[PDB]
Amino acid sequence: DVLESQFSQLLHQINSTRDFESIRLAHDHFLSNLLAQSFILLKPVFHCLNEILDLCHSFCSLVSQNLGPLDERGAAQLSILVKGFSRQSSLLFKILSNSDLAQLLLRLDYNKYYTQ
Amino acid sequence: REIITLQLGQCGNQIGFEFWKQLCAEHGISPEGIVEEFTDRKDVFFYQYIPRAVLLRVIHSILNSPYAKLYGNNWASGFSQGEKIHEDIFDIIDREADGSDSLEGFVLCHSIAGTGSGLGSYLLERLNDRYPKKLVQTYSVFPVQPYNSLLTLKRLTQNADCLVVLDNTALNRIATDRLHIQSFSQINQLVSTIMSASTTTLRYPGYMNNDLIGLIASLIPTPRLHFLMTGYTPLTTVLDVMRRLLQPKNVMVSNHCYIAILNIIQGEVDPTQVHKSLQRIRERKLANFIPWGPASIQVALSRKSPYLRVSGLMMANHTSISSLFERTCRQYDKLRKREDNFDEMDTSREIVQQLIDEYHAATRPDYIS
Amino acid sequence: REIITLQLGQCGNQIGFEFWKQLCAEHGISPEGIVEEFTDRKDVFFYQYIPRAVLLRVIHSILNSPYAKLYGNNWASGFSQGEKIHEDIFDIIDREADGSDSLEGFVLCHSIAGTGSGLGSYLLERLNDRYPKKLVQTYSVFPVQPYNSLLTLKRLTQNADCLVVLDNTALNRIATDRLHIQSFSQINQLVSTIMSASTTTLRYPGYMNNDLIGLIASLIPTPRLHFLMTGYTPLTTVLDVMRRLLQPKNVMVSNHCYIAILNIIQGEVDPTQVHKSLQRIRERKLANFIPWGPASIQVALSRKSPYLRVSGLMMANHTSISSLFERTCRQYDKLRKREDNFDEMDTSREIVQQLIDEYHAATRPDYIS
Amino acid sequence: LGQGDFIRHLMDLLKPELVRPATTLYQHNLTGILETAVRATNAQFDSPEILRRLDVRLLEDTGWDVFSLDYHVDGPIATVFTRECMSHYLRVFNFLWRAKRMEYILTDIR
Ligand SMILES: Nc1nc2c(ncn2[C@@H]2O[C@H](COP(=O)(O)OP(=O)(O)O)[C@@H](O)[C@H]2O)c(=O)[nH]1
Numbered sequence: 009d010v011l012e013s014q015f016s017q018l019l020h021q022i023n024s025t026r027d028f029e030s031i032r033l034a035h036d037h038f039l040s041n042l043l044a045q046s047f048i049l050l051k052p053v054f055h056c057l058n059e060i061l062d063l064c065h066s067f068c069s070l071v072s073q074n075l076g077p078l079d080e081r082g083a084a085q086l087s088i089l090v091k092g093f094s095r096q097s098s099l100l101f102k103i104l105s106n107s108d109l110a111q112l113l114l115r116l117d118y119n120k121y122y123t124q
Numbered sequence: 125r126e127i128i129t130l131q132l133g134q135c136g137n138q139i140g141f142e143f144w145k146q147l148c149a150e151h152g153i154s155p156e157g158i159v160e161e162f163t164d165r166k167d168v169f170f171y172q173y174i175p176r177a178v179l180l181r182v183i184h185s186i187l188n189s190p191y192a193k194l195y196g197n198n199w200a201s202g203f204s205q206g207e208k209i210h211e212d213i214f215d216i217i218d219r220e221a222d223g224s225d226s227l228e229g230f231v232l233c234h235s236i237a238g239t240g241s242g243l244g245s246y247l248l249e250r251l252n253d254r255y256p257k258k259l260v261q262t263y264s265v266f267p268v269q270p271y272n273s274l275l276t277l278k279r280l281t282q283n284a285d286c287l288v289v290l291d292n293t294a295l296n297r298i299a300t301d302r303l304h305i306q307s308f309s310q311i312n313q314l315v316s317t318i319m320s321a322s323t324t325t326l327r328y329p330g331y332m333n334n335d336l337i338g339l340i341a342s343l344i345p346t347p348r349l350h351f352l353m354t355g356y357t358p359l360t361t362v363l364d365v366m367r368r369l370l371q372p373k374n375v376m377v378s379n380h381c382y383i384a385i386l387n388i389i390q391g392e393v394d395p396t397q398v399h400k401s402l403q404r405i406r407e408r409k410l411a412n413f414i415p416w417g418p419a420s421i422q423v424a425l426s427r428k429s430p431y432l433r434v435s436g437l438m439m440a441n442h443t444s445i446s447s448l449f450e451r452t453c454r455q456y457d458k459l460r461k462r463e464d465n466f467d468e469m470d471t472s473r474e475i476v477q478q479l480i481d482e483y484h485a486a487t488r489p490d491y492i493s
Numbered sequence: 494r495e496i497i498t499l500q501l502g503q504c505g506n507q508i509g510f511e512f513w514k515q516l517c518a519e520h521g522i523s524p525e526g527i528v529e530e531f532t533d534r535k536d537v538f539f540y541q542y543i544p545r546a547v548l549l550r551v552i553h554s555i556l557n558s559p560y561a562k563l564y565g566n567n568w569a570s571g572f573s574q575g576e577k578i579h580e581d582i583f584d585i586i587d588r589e590a591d592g593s594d595s596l597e598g599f600v601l602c603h604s605i606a607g608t609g610s611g612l613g614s615y616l617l618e619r620l621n622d623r624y625p626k627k628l629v630q631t632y633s634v635f636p637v638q639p640y641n642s643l644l645t646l647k648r649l650t651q652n653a654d655c656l657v658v659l660d661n662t663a664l665n666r667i668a669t670d671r672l673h674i675q676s677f678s679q680i681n682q683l684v685s686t687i688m689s690a691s692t693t694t695l696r697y698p699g700y701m702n703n704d705l706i707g708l709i710a711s712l713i714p715t716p717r718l719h720f721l722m723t724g725y726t727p728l729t730t731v732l733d734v735m736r737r738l739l740q741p742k743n744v745m746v747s748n749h750c751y752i753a754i755l756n757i758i759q760g761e762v763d764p765t766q767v768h769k770s771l772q773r774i775r776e777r778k779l780a781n782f783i784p785w786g787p788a789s790i791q792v793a794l795s796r797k798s799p800y801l802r803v804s805g806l807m808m809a810n811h812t813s814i815s816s817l818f819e820r821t822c823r824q825y826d827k828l829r830k831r832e833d834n835f836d837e838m839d840t841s842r843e844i845v846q847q848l849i850d851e852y853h854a855a856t857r858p859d860y861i862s
Numbered sequence: 863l864g865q866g867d868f869i870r871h872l873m874d875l876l877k878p879e880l881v882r883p884a885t886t887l888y889q890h891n892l893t894g895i896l897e898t899a900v901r902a903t904n905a906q907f908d909s910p911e912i913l914r915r916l917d918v919r920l921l922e923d924t925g926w927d928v929f930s931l932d933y934h935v936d937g938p939i940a941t942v943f944t945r946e947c948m949s950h951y952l953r954v955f956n957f958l959w960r961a962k963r964m965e966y967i968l969t970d971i972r
């Protein structure tokens with residue numbers, strides 16, 4: 009809903025203006041929006057969610073690197089991330105509190121983070 | 125990743141044949157199993173074309189259809205025969221498995237009412253035995269009749285990693301209201317529209333939802349709560365759709381709150397307003413949710429078949445489905461006082477009661493632990 | 494916020510049907526309930542367009558009308574039959590309430606003179622049971638008639654949150670003066686104009702009075718004194734309208750003093766001279782006010798419907814309304830000495846005596862305590 | 863506040879939020895409610911351009927002391943308002959906000 013929405017405008021600005029000069033600008037603004045909307049340029053959020061990205065690599069590996077219960081220092085490693093993840097979770101929450109309105113609404117549909 | 129279908133009993137074989145009818149017509153595939161001249165990724169349900177079906181009197185009716193080129197009553201009576209021809213049918217599944225690139229799941233279409241009830245019970249156990257790595261989704265159908273239904277539950281509660289419910293009594297009520305039928309061949313038509321729309325995002329190439337795991341994994345939070353119910357509005361903005369879905373007059377079911385909601389939009393609606401509808405819908409606080417687990421409402425777009433206007437289908441995991449089970453259990457208890465060991469029914473009686481508690485406990489602020 | 498209207502008895506249906514005709518023509522709504530091409534906030538009284546009406550022989554003549562696409566005689570007989578269909582009519586209200594975004598109140602149009610009057614008294618009590626936080630305003634209409642009139646008064650004094658009186662004796666005299674009629678369909682023309690004008694500041698939003706409680710919170714000083722009377726200037730400066738409404742030969746009512754006044758000027762008048770006129774009207778002392786607490790006069794402007802000149806509407810709270818109850822009271826006693834317990838009549842006769850006793854004591858310098 | 867219909871709904875939605883102290887208040891949350899409020903009232907039928915400038919600002923207690931609308935304006939039209947009309951409207955908007963909550967309190971008591 010940022011791709012299929014920004015794209016649906018880029019294609020509409022094409023079939024409207026018979027001029028070509030608009031296309032070089034409509035397409036250029038389309039591209040800048042993706043870098044701006046998808047938070048790729050916004051450094052703080054992009055340097056916080058990035059920590060969430062590689063975080064799941066560790067957790068998913070932990071469950072796949074065995075088939076028994078988390079006893080051999082897995083639980084000892086398990087409680088490490090939740091102290092950081094849940095910290096990283098609510099850390100992001102203060103960041104969003106222009107464009108985040110479309111995003112934070114979905115995560116907050118049941119007001120769960122409101123209890124965080 | 126291909127998914128093969130399995131059809132049992134009268135109901136299963138009748139709707140699955142029609143399920144393909146709607147599916148083959150959705151693509152440009154003539155009844156004689158060939159592409160017509162006249163984008164749509166068809167790898168999941170067709171092999172090169174031939175559908176990956178495994179069917180098990182009525183076959184005569186199907187073999188007499190123009191689609192000839194497209195390929196007891198007690199639970200004990202059904203389960204007994206299935207064990208005898210175990211190796212016979214599992215040859216078909218095996219030869220269809222390795223013939224597939226990477227098998228992913230096992231759709232099952234049957235009615236819990238009679239041979240499909242027991243044979244399906246036999247299959248699900250054996251399917252989990254040989255294959256432990258395969259998802260098992262089932263399109264079970266609800267209505268001595270109660271005894272057959274309770275036995276199937278005992279298997280469906282722990283084997284099938286996913287499930288959908290389709291009750292005829294609620295479906296038949298939709299017939300007299302909006303279709304004025306008073307017929308199986310008519311009430312089945314809605315099922316085909318329900319089934320086909322249930323798997324729209326799999327055949328049309330999209331950003332996400334490219335696998336059965338990509339759909340169900342959002343709904344089922346815990347392997348105990350693996351039941352869904354369906355909703356279908358078109359019988360025109362996105363807000364018009366989402367409102368008409370959540371009305372209790374449209375859903376196919378006969379305190380309580382949702383666990384997760386999925387929305388399937390098969391129209392060409394403008395996708396800029398979709399995030400707006402959720403805003404207004406959330407504010408209206410039209411639907412209640414669990415207070416323990418963070419979840420949301422899922423909405424996904426699609427495209428209608430150009431070879432065939434906006435539709436919409438909704439997938440729901442509502443704790444109100446526990447009410448239906450009670451009726452079966454309530455009736456059985458009446459039968460147990462009305463008339464080689466008769467203990468298998470007793471153990472199932474226990475395990476089905478556990479599921480009723482798990483739903484009831486799920487609506488609490490402290491369901492966990 | 495929304496306001497659901499109810500129409501009871503022959504009178505409620507007629508004056509409500511004429512209220513909706515006038516309200517549809519005031520807006521851009523075709524008789525087919527479809528918006529014509531041809532600012533006015535219409536979400537309060539119309540649902541996306543569908544009126545939020547609950548109608549309760551006369552229905553057939555409404556259904557044979559061009560507006561079909563827009564949707565005994567005792568008090569005890571009218572009370573019991575409502576008890577036997579208690580669950581029935583509420584399902585219509587329960588779905589309309591929860592289908593509504595945020596309910597605000599319940600407009601009731603009924604005549605207290607007899608199945609409709611009996612049904613009304615029943616419904617007024619149950620709404621207090623179920624919904625405690627919803628206003629109930631009643632556009633009652635005054636005329637074994639003395640019996641039924643006082644019984645419903647027992648409920649209207651402690652159940653209905655507000656009340657606007659409209660007596661036929663004052664309307665009929667107006668029809669035999671400026672109307673010159675010598676019919677029910679004729680006097681209802683005037684009733685429709687007062688009703689349509691009463692909720693004018695709700696449909697055309699302004700800086701103030703954007704909710705039903707905003708109009709009522711100023712007039713009604715205590716929950717007991719919740720009776721109002723009306724005044725129509727026409728049957729031009731703003732100083733003329735005010736001096737043409739305070740006159741007693743324009744009020745729809747057959748010492749004493751005013752408690753609060755509200756003026757609705759619906760014209761295109763100059764809104765800068767409105768504050769001037771209130772500066773002069775005070776000097777001539779055209780109205781006498783309560784001595785205990787402070788009271789004033791209120792003027793509110795609006796805009797007439799362009800799709801259809803200066804008009805006025807005066808809502809006042811005069812203690813002279815106590816006389817109307819006295820007539821019904823005295824008429825009751827004469828029949829009580831002339832002819833399972835007959836104890837409800839005793840309680841109703843007693844409670845209305847306290848209401849009258851409040852009014853006569855509301856005009857004293859020591860109404861406090 | 864010349865609209866009245868829109869400010870009514872906007873005072874019903876900010877009630878659960880502003881009762882909390884200002885320390886737990888973050889601007890990113892109130893905007894969502896503001897967008898919904900325009901749709902929930904008659905202000906939706908309006909020029910999209912002027913609706914692009916209407917937002918919220920957080921003055922710098924309680925949530926009923928730091929909330930106020932801004933309606934920032936830049937460009938050629940900014941030569942009529944000149945940063946002083948925007949420093950006067952906010953000086954007015956407080957007096958119209960107080961005299962509006964002191965009324966919806968007194969219609970709640972009633
Ligand atoms: N809704 C629906 N239900 C069906 C249809 N055909 C069969 N059924 C259900 O299947 C049950 C009977 O199955 P049955 O004929 O005994 O299966 P069999 O023993 O394998 O032949 C009934 O309870 C029906 O509700 C159909 O076309 N539509």
Ligand SMILES: Nc1nc2c(ncn2[C@@H]2O[C@H](COP(=O)(O)OP(=O)(O)O)[C@@H](O)[C@H]2O)c(=O)[nH]1
Nearest residue numbers: 502503504507604606607608609634636677681
């Ligand atoms: N103001 C007004 N009152 C009416 C109208 N029609 C009937 N009424 C009143 O309704 C009363 C008759 O009630 P009726 O219709 O017999 O009650 P029902 O038979 O129980 O519906 C009379 O005393 C009238 O005063 C009308 O058009 N306007």
